[PDB]
Design a protein around this ligand. Structure first.
Ligand SMILES: [Zn+2]
Lengths: 1340, 151, 452, 79
């Protein structure tokens, strides 16, 4: 057990012995990036394969050459946070050592000609945190693993799109990891056609002629040959017996001197059985039988050397005779049983007009290069590029192995390019299944799809940069000098860096991650999609892909995906999801052995399990022996069944082995519909952690692990003892067993204060521990924004009863009590951003100074002299932050303003203001400022104020770091000086430093003196090094644009708490707007005076089957039935043993739940702190499907001295009555979301306009105007209204004279109109007349 | 599917039951998604046909049109001749199976008093002046339409 | 044109223009030369290609791009389809004097009224106010007026109330399918930031109070004012012109309140007795002397007319439960007690309504509806209504039907193991027996929930 | 134009022999010519960006909406 465990324990109700604790959660992102960057000697992954692929590199034609050797990472310039703050990417440089070598092709291979060893920077590399994310431009971002169609080879069968036929359309396809595609297919009219890369239809044999094949060899391999034997008078044949299998005879189909099947008669399976056993294969027959068959191959009378017959030529009887005169006693022939064998290929040859390799390749060349003349070399060059060149075609061996499997091949490896045998065998399989043998495959089956993780993407962009470089290097190598041209001379790295930085920040995969809540992070990185490149599109995509397949089970949870278009597209991961080396998924499963369930495991892919059988964990096992009952709900083969006991081979692992985590947290999910559970789990992400961390009592257990692995919060890495604490940070010391001796081995953990989220929300950590305490590794020390003692919490729990109330909960609205807002317990805060900037101009710069005319002096009062507000101040809309000013030009004027400034005579300078200000409606508090300035420009007064500030601040942080470090490191100077001589009573009083020079002795203390000498030299070494290092790390200016001079930032903050119009909900789809607060006097109250917190509407519970939640409400109440009771014992202040008994009796309530406990173990004090925690409640952890039962809750309410109903007798408060009947009441857990009335409200009366068309914009940030589509207008003309929309088009959008006139007029109380004509109309007129058009208008 | 459910919510589900409910509900949502698309699509066409039409006249003065007949096929009534015509106009001088009992000057409104009065008799098919009959040049006569329902 | 950062941006058309011009003049260079007409043809080709690329890029063939690996714009792409000027800049509009918000409920409203957060309206009636300040001599000018307005004195709010008198509004949910996706309302205002909405019309919008936002425009001028008062005003729009049913179905709790209230059990008290009229019936129920669900012989009164608009006093006695007696109290003078001695599920309410309309019309109907919603919510709250586990009822014999069905499938399993039935016959058998079990268990569970 | 060309011809080699981007003073020294030219060059070196670029995540709306007619009038100031 643990300490934070002892600080508070949550209760169990699950009776299934787990065998596998959850793993680390997000291993995959880490693993992918690792294997991308890090080293591979031989089994190439990542960079090294990209290089070895694209290296070595010759000259233009050979004489010089380049040789990859090895790479070199660079540690970065800065740390994380410095990059965070400057708006800068975190990244590592890259060098590579290259070797240029020339060899005298003038000589035979005269190598020893020159060498240049040199290593070269090219590009830097963004990097991964320990969490798993990246950062760019002071922006934290994450990309997403993808899911798409594997390489290899696929089949399919379209459903008669010449549905005149209603016929099958078999077709087959290969897909490489790179290169060109290929499509084979049957036409409806019984002929093969083929096409690369969705080109036009071509035949299938066309390629074979193109590949130097013969019709001879073609029919050698494809067909099973029908052969004859004529000896000078008439025909014999040879009947492989099952060739008339089920067929009808033609003549007296008859044995040697015997008939088996007469004319026009079925050849039974038994007649061919006779033919098989009765051992005849030499069958004299009528020759007229031949009429219909086809020649094998051209067997002529070569005496002439003239064609009596060409292959692929249906036979005759005259020609039978002609080759009889040749003397040839047999000519082999083709087979055709339309049932079993398909001569479609022979038919295709008969359609083929082509003969040779050459014109075949001409036509190929032509198709892929239309309009181009025939040229041999280019033809064979093209072909050889497309399918056997390593340059432009790659399977990426998963395709290779998978292909091999799909052909049932004994081997797994090969190349990333083709053989010929491949093509043969695939067309053979296609025709075999066209006959009907085998099966087509299903695309949705996960054994045919693959993820695509980060390392793969990054490989791609990196190598394509390498190729953008080698183009030039080919352009340059054999051209010029070959002794002075250094390797570096030719490389630009900017293609590489360009590619990679464009990917990490402008692909549609990288996103600004979700700083709402921990789970938001962990799920948003545990997302999967099939969008983007190598992917799909919702309009291109349909329904089969959206939906579910029975192989998802154990890999992907069907419940957690939004409600818009992109429904089944994304499918977030499962829990025990591992992936595979090739990119495949797998899931653990338990081994069975002779009915025994063994503890060992295997991780199994999407495929093998169907061949196997698998049981479930609902199965109540018979205590270490076998499983209890005979029938067991197992499954194989895609679906389920019931099986016996010896019959089974494997079993599932847990009762959660499918779900996602949001599909994990909620208990009694079993008692709910699916759709609403989905909705709520998607409601479980838009939340805020409010001002506090009010824990949910009832959960499952997963809260702590998600909390930890989010990495938001602190944790131990070595056990030990606290040494110092502050709200800002802590200090620890390590135990000496965990201590490594030479290192200082004394840790520290600074913390994160109020800090803008990507979603403009606070962030903060905090400690939840004490001093003088022990700690072990991994023990938490501080909490995140949504945690409490290392266990998640987002919202809060509280009192609800179920009833209508006067209409204020009409349709799933809400009604609440005013204690909760004065408590501020869902109150939250929002960091917000603003900034201004100083630049150059053509006239001159913008500059930064208070001194600005035409100002209310009190506005200036809030500033320093530089023109800048202080810290910790109050701000209101329209207030000023910065006095920035701009060199003016000139101002032309009117006679009346001229008149006024002739009267008073005031002027303007040749400067004006650029004062940053508060946006409208905002008000808040300033708590930080940040300023950046170029390296070279003078840091002005306040720039220096904060520069010397942060100087002091970090220097104090570091002199503290020092001071603690050196202080602990004086450990020598007492044990060493008080021995090696001893004068302690005389020594201790004296100054510490004048102790080198006391009574000095034999060489032991000489070594002591030199030791301390070197060490207090290392003293000032450390000082100089570290201080000055960071000193000019800091004091240096900034890396930024032209024009700019310096900038200003402001990190202010604002306080938000609850008012109407807000959304909130709970863990079961129970949405709701809030409609009104109320006082407590109007709320109810039990007989014992306790009022109620919130009230809702109970009608809609069967309306939407969110039934399970009600259960918890009972349970909810029950917790405090202990909690409050214990608080009595607190103030009653009884005694140890009473509550000790009481609480172990509580934990031993249920029947057979697994968690045990012995509190006799504990102290008194452990117990009393435990109770001081539990004083407010007792939290529970029932898992989802090893859930609890109402038997226990009713037992527990008997324990807490309460109704078995959890349903009790209530009063009104506005008039004091009793109600007519009981009501269900308890505490439930709910929370807020990020859809807030002032984040959602806007109005407008006049303002921002376009210029293309001059009607207003949209967007609240830019003073949004409202939209008015084309169906509203349909409605209005429905009512018969013209004047209204006349106004809505003339004046409130486009016409200018009208809008101005009428403004001026209503200010004179005139509600009148004066229309004209719009502008977008005349726009359209011009834009037509551009097109050569005499459009115009007729006078009346 | 072969084997059904064996429980309810209150009994507490098991894995497969919910697992199998999933794809059903997901299909329901997928179908929910995009009825909207085709709906608005064809709807825009529906309108764009009918940009023009408008009333211009009260009485076309034209010939009778259709005969109305109820929908009692397959089972019993599903739209009575009584109910459908409510608010239409009358084609023609008609009367009751009690013969020679006329009710119109070729044209009368059909408020429910008359549907009652005529549900007395066993009248079971009756003609109407519809728009197809109406011969208004770029317009439609009122009487060939019926009643304004909202009014 | 530039933007703030100092960078120009270019109507890509410009590129499409400029190249063209230069080649034209290149031709005029070569024109001085009578050079090989081959290359001249090359230049002609280049022109024609450029021109038709400009007028419609992806029409002749290859759609040309800029540097971005991205296509371009002809002129036509300004006119066509979605981003065409028609349905993006000529019918898909933006509007001044507008706003929006989230919505919620006013369960006390007088439906022709609407909820409104103030500050929205404070922007939306602004230059009005400016003119009126100038009119009253308070702020004789516009920056004076504006400073007072930013200063938002109580006079300002007073004059806001002055203007909103009579001065209407107009709504919009999205997506407007039919025309009752807007109605005209009358302003009433709320200290908040959310709009309160009269519950009934939610179905006219298909609006559900689970994150709803809708929008506002103004019937600014006078003709709009009149129309929105006369036409889109929700009072004058109650019947679907698709089909003359009304859309004022009271939905889910008001109905529940009535049904609970008007109900004829026996259980309670105060039984087999007499009254003089409903008023002391109300009296005693307030006193806790007898429940409403208890049948009683009392007096009533009702009115009719077969007349030339001339009423008929009539009076009598009836058996009745009590709530019936009370809610007689509203009904205006044209309808009998026959309508109120039932349990009142939805359609009953629909029919009392449409009768009132057909017999009287509009104003009494809306009033009746208002009082219905009021009293339904009120007595529904008094009613008390909750949900629990045990409110849901298993039959006991849910184990046994299932066991005998298991016997059935065991039988047909072993028969198919003998291999007589096709699996399709078996399939049909199985589905039929399971539907049998389902519907009979439905029978049983209703037999333990309906009147027991 | 050739100024920009030679500038970048030097910049490539500053990139190598630094492993890092240049500084205006350093290549000013290496080129022996003064700062503000480099300043206004890099101010002027960049090209325009296409009114109808897709600033949205998807084709949500291009950059045109995000532009102001900061030219003509204020009806307030007009009155
Ligand atoms: Zn007509």
């Amino acid at each position: 057990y643990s300490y934070t465990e002892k600080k508070r324990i949550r209760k169990d109700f699950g009776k299934r012995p787990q065998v596998l604790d959850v793993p680390y959660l997000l291993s995959i992102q880490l693993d992918s990036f690792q294997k991308f960057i890090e080293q591979d000697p031989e089994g190439q992954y990542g960079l090294e394969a990209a290089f070895r692929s694209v290296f070595p590199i010759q000259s233009y034609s050979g004489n010089s050459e380049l040789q990859y050797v090895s790479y070199r990472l660079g540690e970065p310039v800065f740390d994380v946070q410095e990059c965070q703050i400057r708006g800068v990417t975190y990244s590592a440089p890259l060098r590579v050592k290259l070797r240029l070598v020339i060899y005298e092709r003038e000589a035979p291979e005269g190598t020893v000609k020159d060498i240049k060893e040199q290593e070269v920077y090219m590009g830097e590399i963004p990097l991964m945190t320990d969490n798993g994310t990246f950062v760019i431009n002071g922006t934290e971002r994450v990309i997403v693993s993808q899911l798409h169609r594997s390489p290899g080879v696929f089949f399919d069968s379209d459903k008669g799109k010449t549905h005149s036929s209603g016929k099958v359309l078999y077709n087959a396809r290969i897909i490489p990891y790179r290169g060109s595609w290929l499509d084979f297919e049957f036409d409806p009219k019984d002929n093969l056609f083929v096409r690369i890369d969705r080109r036009r239809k071509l035949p299938a044999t066309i390629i074979l002629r193109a590949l130097n094949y013969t019709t001879e060899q073609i029919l050698d391999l494809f067909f099973e040959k029908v052969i004859f034997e004529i000896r000078d008078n008439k025909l014999q044949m040879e009947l492989v017996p099952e060739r008339l299998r089920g067929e009808t005879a033609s003549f007296d189909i008859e044995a040697n001197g015997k008939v088996y099947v007469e004319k026009g008669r079925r050849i039974t399976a038994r007649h061919i059985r006779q033919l098989e056993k009765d051992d005849v294969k030499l069958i004299e027959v009528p020759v007229e039988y031949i009429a219909g068959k086809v020649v094998a191959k051209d067997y002529i009378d070569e005496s002439t050397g003239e064609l009596i017959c060409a292959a692929n030529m249906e036979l005759s009887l005259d020609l039978l005779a002609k080759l009889s005169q040749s003397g040839h006693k047999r000519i082999e022939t083709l087979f055709t049983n339309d049932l079993d064998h398909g001569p479609y290929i022979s038919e295709t040859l008969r359609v083929d007009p082509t003969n040779d390799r050459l014109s075949a390749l001409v036509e190929i060349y032509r198709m892929m290069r239309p309009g181009e003349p025939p040229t041999r070399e280019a033809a064979e060059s093209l072909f050889e590029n497309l399918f056997f060149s390593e340059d432009r075609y790659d399977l990426s061996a998963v395709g290779r192995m998978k292909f091999n499997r799909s052909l049932l091949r004994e081997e797994i490896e090969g190349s990333g390019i083709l053989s010929k045998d491949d093509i043969i065998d695939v067309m053979k399989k296609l025709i075999d299944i066209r006959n009907g043998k085998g099966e087509v495959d299903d695309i949705d089956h996960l054994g045919n799809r693959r993820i695509r993780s980060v390392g793969e993407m990054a490989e791609n962009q990196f190598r394509v940069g390498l190729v953008r470089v080698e183009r030039a290097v080919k352009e340059r190598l054999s051209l010029g000098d070959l002794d002075t041209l250094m390797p570096q001379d030719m490389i630009n790295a900017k293609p590489i860096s360009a590619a990679v930085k464009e990917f990490f920040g402008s692909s549609q995969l990288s996103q600004f991650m979700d700083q709402n809540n921990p789970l938001s992070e962990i799920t948003h990185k545990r997302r999967i999609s099939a969008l983007g490149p190598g992917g799909l599109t919702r309009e291109r995509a349909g329904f089969e892909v959206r939906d579910v397949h029975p192989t998802h089970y154990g890999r992907v949870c069907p419940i957690e995906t939004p409600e818009g278009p992109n429904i089944g597209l994304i499918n977030s991961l499962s829990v025990y999801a591992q992936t595979n080396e090739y990119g495949f998924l797998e899931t653990p499963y338990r081994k069975v052995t002779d009915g025994v369930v063994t503890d060992e495991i295997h991780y199994l892919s999407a495929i093998e399990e169907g061949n196997y059988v698998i049981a479930q964990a609902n199965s109540n096992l018979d205590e270490e022996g076998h499983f209890v009952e005979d029938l067991v709900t197992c499954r194989s083969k895609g679906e389920s069944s019931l099986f016996s006991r010896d019959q089974v081979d494997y079993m599932d692992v847990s009762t959660q082995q499918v779900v996602s985590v949001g599909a994990s947290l909620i208990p009694f999910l079993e008692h709910d519909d699916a759709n609403r559970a989905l909705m709520g789990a998607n409601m479980q992400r838009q939340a805020v952690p409010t001002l506090r961390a009010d824990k949910p009592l009832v959960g499952t257990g997963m809260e702590r692990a998600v909390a930890v692995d989010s990495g938001v919060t602190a944790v131990a890495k070595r056990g030990g003892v606290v040494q110092y604490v502050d709200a800002s940070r802590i200090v620890i010391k390590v135990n000496e067993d965990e201590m490594y001796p030479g290192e200082a081995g004394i840790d520290i953990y600074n913390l994160t204060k109020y800090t803008r989220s990507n979603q403009n929300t606070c962030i903060n950590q905090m400690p939840c521990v004490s001093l003088g305490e022990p700690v072990e590794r991994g023990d938490v020390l501080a909490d995140g924004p949504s945690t409490d003692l290392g266990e998640l919490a987002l919202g809060q729990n509280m009192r609800v009863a179920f009833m209508p109330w006067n209409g204020y909960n009409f349709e799933d609205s809400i009604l609440v009590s005013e204690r909760v807002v004065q408590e501020d317990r869902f109150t939250t805060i929002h960091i917000q951003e603003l900034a201004c900037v100083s630049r150059d101009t053509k006239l001159g710069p913008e500059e930064i100074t208070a001194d600005i005319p035409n100002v209310g002096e009190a506005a200036l009062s809030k500033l320093d002299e530089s023109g800048i507000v202080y810290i910790g101040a109050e701000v209101t809309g329209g207030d000023i932050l910065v006095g920035k000013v701009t060199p003016k030009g000139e101002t032309q004027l009117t006679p009346e303003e001229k008149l006024l400034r002739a009267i008073f005579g005031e002027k303007a300078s040749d400067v004006k203001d650029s004062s940053l200000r508060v946006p409208n409606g905002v008000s808040g508090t300033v708590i930080d400022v940040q300023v950046f300035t170029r390296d070279g420009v003078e840091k002005d007064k306040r720039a220096l104020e904060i520069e010397e500030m942060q100087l002091k601040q970090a220097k104090k942080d570091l002199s503290e770091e020092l001071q603690i470090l050196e202080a602990g490191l004086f450990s020598r100077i007492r044990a060493v000086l008080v021995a090696g001589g001893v004068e302690a009573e005389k020594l201790d009083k004296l100054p510490r430093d004048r102790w080198l020079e006391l009574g000095l002795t034999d060489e032991e203390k000489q070594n002591q003196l030199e030791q301390l000498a070197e060490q207090y030299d290392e003293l000032k070494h450390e000082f100089e090094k570290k201080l000055e290092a960071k000193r000019r790390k800091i004091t240096q200016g900034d890396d930024l644009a032209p024009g700019v001079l310096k900038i200003v930032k402001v990190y202010l903050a604002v306080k938000r708490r609850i008012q109407p119009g807000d959304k909130m909900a709970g863990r079961h789809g129970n949405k709701g707007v809030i409609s009104k607060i109320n006082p407590i006097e109007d709320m109810p109250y039990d007989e014992n005076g306790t009022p109620v917190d919130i009230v809702l509407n109970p009608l809609g519970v069967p309306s939407r089957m969110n039934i399970g939640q009600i259960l918890e409400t009972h349970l909810g109440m029950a917790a405090k039935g202990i909690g409050d009771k214990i608080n009595a014992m607190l103030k009653q202040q009884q005694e140890v043993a009473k509550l000790r008994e009481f609480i172990q009796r509580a934990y031993d309530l249920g029947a057979d739940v697994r968690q045990k406990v012995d509190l006799s173990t504990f102290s008194d004090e452990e117990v009393m702190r435990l109770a001081e925690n539990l004083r407010k409640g007792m939290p529970i952890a029932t898992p989802v499907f090893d859930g609890a039962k109402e038997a226990e809750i009713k037992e527990l309410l008997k324990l807490g001295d309460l109704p078995t109903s959890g349903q009790i007798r209530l009063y009104d408060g506005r008039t004091g009555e009793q109600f007519e009947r009981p009501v269900t009441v308890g505490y439930m857990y709910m929370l807020k979301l990020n859809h807030l009335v002032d984040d959602k409200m806007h109005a407008r009366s006049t303002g921002s306009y376009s210029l293309v068309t001059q009607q207003p914009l949209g967007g609240k940030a830019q003073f949004g105007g409202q939209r008015f589509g084309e169906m509203e207008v349909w409605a209005l003309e429905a009512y018969g209204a013209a004047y209204t929309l006349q106004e809505m088009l003339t004046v409130k959008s486009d016409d200018v004279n009208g809008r101005t006139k009428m403004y001026k007029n209503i200010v004179d109380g005139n509600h009148q109109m004066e229309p004209g004509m719009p502008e977008s109309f005349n726009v359209l007129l011009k834009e037509i007349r551009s097109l050569g058009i005499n459009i115009e208008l007729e006078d009346e | 599917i072969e084997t059904p459910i064996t429980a309810n919510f209150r009994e507490g589900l098991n894995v497969l039951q919910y697992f199998i409910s999933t794809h059903g509900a997901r299909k329901g949502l997928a179908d929910t998604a995009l009825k909207t698309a085709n709906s608005g699509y064809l709807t825009r066409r529906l309108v764009d046909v009918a940009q023009d039409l408008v009333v211009t006249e009260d009485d076309c003065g034209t010939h009778e049109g259709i005969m109305m007949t109820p929908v009692i096929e397959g089972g019993d009534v599903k739209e009575p001749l009584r109910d459908r015509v409510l608010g239409r106009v009358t084609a023609e001088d008609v009367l009751k199976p009690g013969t020679a009992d006329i009710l119109v000057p070729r044209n009368t409104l059909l408020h429910e008093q008359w549907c009652d009065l005529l549900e007395e008799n066993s009248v079971d098919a009756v003609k109407v002046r519809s728009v197809v009959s109406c011969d208004t040049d770029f317009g439609v006569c009122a009487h060939c339409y019926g009643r304004d329902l909202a009014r | 044109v530039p933007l703030d950062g100092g960078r120009f941006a270019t109507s890509d058309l410009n590129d499409l223009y400029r190249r063209v011009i230069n080649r034209n003049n290149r031709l005029k260079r070569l024109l001085d030369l009578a050079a090989p007409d081959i290359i001249v043809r090359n230049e002609k080709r280049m022109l024609q290609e450029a021109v038709d690329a400009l007028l419609d890029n992806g029409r002749r063939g290859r759609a040309i791009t800029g540097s971005n690996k991205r296509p371009l714009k002809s002129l036509a792409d300004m006119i066509k389809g979605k981003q065409g000027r028609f349905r993006q800049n000529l019918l898909g509009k933006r509007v001044d004097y507008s706003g929006r918000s989230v919505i919620t409920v006013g369960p006390y409203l007088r439906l022709h009224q609407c909820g409104l957060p103030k500050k929205m309206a404070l922007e939306l009636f602004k230059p009005f106010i400016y003119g009126k300040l100038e009119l009253r001599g308070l702020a004789t000018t516009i920056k004076a007026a504006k400073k007072m307005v930013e200063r938002e004195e109580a006079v300002v709010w007073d004059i806001l109330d002055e203007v909103i008198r009579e001065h209407p509004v107009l709504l919009n949910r999205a997506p407007t399918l039919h025309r009752l996706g807007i109605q005209a309302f009358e302003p009433v205002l709320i200290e908040g930031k959310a709009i309160q909405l009269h519950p009934l019309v939610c179905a006219a919008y298909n609006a559900d109070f689970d994150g709803d936002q809708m929008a506002v425009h103004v019937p600014l001028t006078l003709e709009a004012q009149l129309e929105a008062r006369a036409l889109m005003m929700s009072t004058n729009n109650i019947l679907s012109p698709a089909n003359g049913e009304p859309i004022i179905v009271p939905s889910q709790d008001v109905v529940l309140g009535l049904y609970y209230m008007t109900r004829d059990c026996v259980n309670a008290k105060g039984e087999g007795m007499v009254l003089t009229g409903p008023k002391e019936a109300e009296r005693l129920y307030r006193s806790g002397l007898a429940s409403l669900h208890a049948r009683v012989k009392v007096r009533i009164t009702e009115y009719e007319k077969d007349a030339n608009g001339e009423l008929v006093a009539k009076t009598s006695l009836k058996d009745t439960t009590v709530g019936r007696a009370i809610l007689w109290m509203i009904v205006p003078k044209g309808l009998p007690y026959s309508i109120v001695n039932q349990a009142l599920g939805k359609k009953a309410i629909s029919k009392m309504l449409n009768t009132c309309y057909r017999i009287l019309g509009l104003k009494p109907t809306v009033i009746f509806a208002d009082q219905i919603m009021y009293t339904g919510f009120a007595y529904a709250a008094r009613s008390g209504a909750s949900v629990g586990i045990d409110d849901m009822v298993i039959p006991e014999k849910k184990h046994e039907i299932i066991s005998e069905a298991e016997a059935e499938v065991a039988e047909i399993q072993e028969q198919f193991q003998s291999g007589l039935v096709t699996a399709g016959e078996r399939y049909n058998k199985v589905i039929d027996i399971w539907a049998a079990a389902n519907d009979r268990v439905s029978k049983a569970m209703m037999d333990n929930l309906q009147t027991e | 134009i050739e100024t920009i060309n030679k500038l970048n011809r030097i910049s490539r080699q500053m990139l190598q022999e630094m492993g890092r981007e240049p500084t205006p003073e350093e290549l000013a020294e290496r080129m022996l010519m003064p700062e503000d030219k480099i300043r206004k060059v890099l101010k002027i070196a960049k090209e325009p960006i296409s009114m109808e670029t897709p600033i949205g995540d998807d084709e949500d709306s291009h950059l045109g909406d995000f532009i102001e007619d900061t030219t003509l009038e204020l009806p307030l100031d007009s009155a």
